[PDB]
Design a protein around this ligand. Sequence first.
Ligand SMILES: O=C(O)C(Cc1ccc(Oc2ccccc2Br)cc1)NC(=O)[C@]12C[C@H]3C[C@H](C[C@H](C3)C1)C2
Ligand SMILES: [Cl-]
Length: 564
Amino acid sequence: MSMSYTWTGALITPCAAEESKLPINALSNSLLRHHNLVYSTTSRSASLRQKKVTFDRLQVLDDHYRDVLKEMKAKASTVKAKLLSVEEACKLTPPHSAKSKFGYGAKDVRSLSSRAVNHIRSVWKDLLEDTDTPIQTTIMAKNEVFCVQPEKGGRKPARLIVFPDLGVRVCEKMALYDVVSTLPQAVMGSSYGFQYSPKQRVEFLVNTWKAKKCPMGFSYDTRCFDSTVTENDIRVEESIYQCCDLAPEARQAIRSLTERLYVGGPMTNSKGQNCGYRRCRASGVLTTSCGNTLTCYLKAAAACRAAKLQDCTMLVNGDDLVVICESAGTQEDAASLRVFTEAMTRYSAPPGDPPQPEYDLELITSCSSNVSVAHDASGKRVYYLTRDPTVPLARAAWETARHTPVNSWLGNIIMYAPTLWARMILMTHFFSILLAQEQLEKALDCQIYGACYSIEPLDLPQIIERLHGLSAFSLHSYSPGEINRVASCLRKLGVPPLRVWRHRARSVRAKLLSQGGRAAICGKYLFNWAVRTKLKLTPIPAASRLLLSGWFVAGYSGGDIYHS
Ligand SMILES: O=C(O)C(Cc1ccc(Oc2ccccc2Br)cc1)NC(=O)[C@]12C[C@H]3C[C@H](C[C@H](C3)C1)C2
Ligand SMILES: [Cl-]
């Protein structure tokens, strides 16, 4: 019986200028034409999200709960985590990270400047000596682009982001970075979804589905997960971390950061005004992904035991949960789900949209995607993940008409490379401009699982072949449903139908060819689909000579992480 937030009256303010509408770049229209369906959320709607996230939490724990928890601790107690030298942690800080309120900035932290490392050290020392005073935090409204869908009641309010000053953030890395990158995997084995690259996630889903006599799966959408995480949920997370073999110093920091940061604390807007008090999960700390995954898995697994799902498998990614089990008859299934929801609700994690049993894999949506099918060169059946490309496109359009620090279009191209909307529209549309500006060599930033990475377009082919396999360049005969969903979308937004992109693709693939080197290996593999005479595509050598290690290991959303 504790509120997720208390508010003072202070508005959530923006620090910069917030553009809500698409500018009208002549280039933007080379992609999307109905630029009035595209929109970005601003701190103008923050008060609506505030109502949504502010609620009371009732939570009753039980035997199933305690049994699973105990099993988790057991596995946790077999993990050993080290600390991180100020230096080591400083390197994990993104070049563009928010500057500290204490004189220095991101580059100063990255460049191990003196003033910075001195504050970072005073902060660390303060964590060891004071284990009670609530650390201060800032609450900003996020600004993400979407498309207008009248079927949902128009537009959606901006999401909130709550984070601590850069000093603290670098400490968090020193104390927990190694833990949140190892504890998760060790406690929930194969259920931990961040250990998989696209090719592996698909493989884990299909295999698990096909491994059931009469498969039955569902996705469980939790209404505002972060807001439901109770203080006991966070102290429980801590007790799990504490199971690891930690340095007496790392233990004091972890305990101190839990009591002072994670379990809640006060918030101020950009103007330094007292905004409110948080008593639920902070969206912008390092343990956000690890914490949500651990806690989402804990409750879910215990609910499976109250509902009696038969031989079930779970795949968790933060607050995103998908469950596949053995069917017990459509009616018994519907009922096992209602008890599942009832158990979850008791664990302080009610849902938004109530879960619904599904019997067709390709009709399940987890991590905003679904399995679909296509065929490789030798006409073999190949599975891959995809989604409605509306948002992806509406954003790929906004990022063409306004410069953005991190661009999703490159993340989508990588993660959804085998899809047809990514290959015929994204690759085509972008490698296009990266020629009308000669930037095939210029590295660009993008996020994956939260971690930030610097990637060069000219390396996409090797990368893709690594996450999706070589088939991803020769997939044909896509399922009609999919082909149709994309086409339907393109018509909605105003994006030239697939045929137009086929033409553009042949062209682009050309200027890229009559440019040889690497720009021609991209036009060769990334566009072998826009030419009748299809050249033979074989294993890329420079595809092995690349370690994508850090990539798919753990999740770091809101963790202010930068991988190099
Ligand atoms: O922010 C995150 O924490 C985050 C998590 C995430 C988890 C599981 C996924 O499983 C899938 C789902 C479909 C295909 C393959 C795989 Br493994 C995909 C993404 N998003 C991104 O990494 C992304 C990467 C790229 C593409 C999207 C949007 C932005 C840019 C954020 C997800
Ligand atoms: Cl179909």
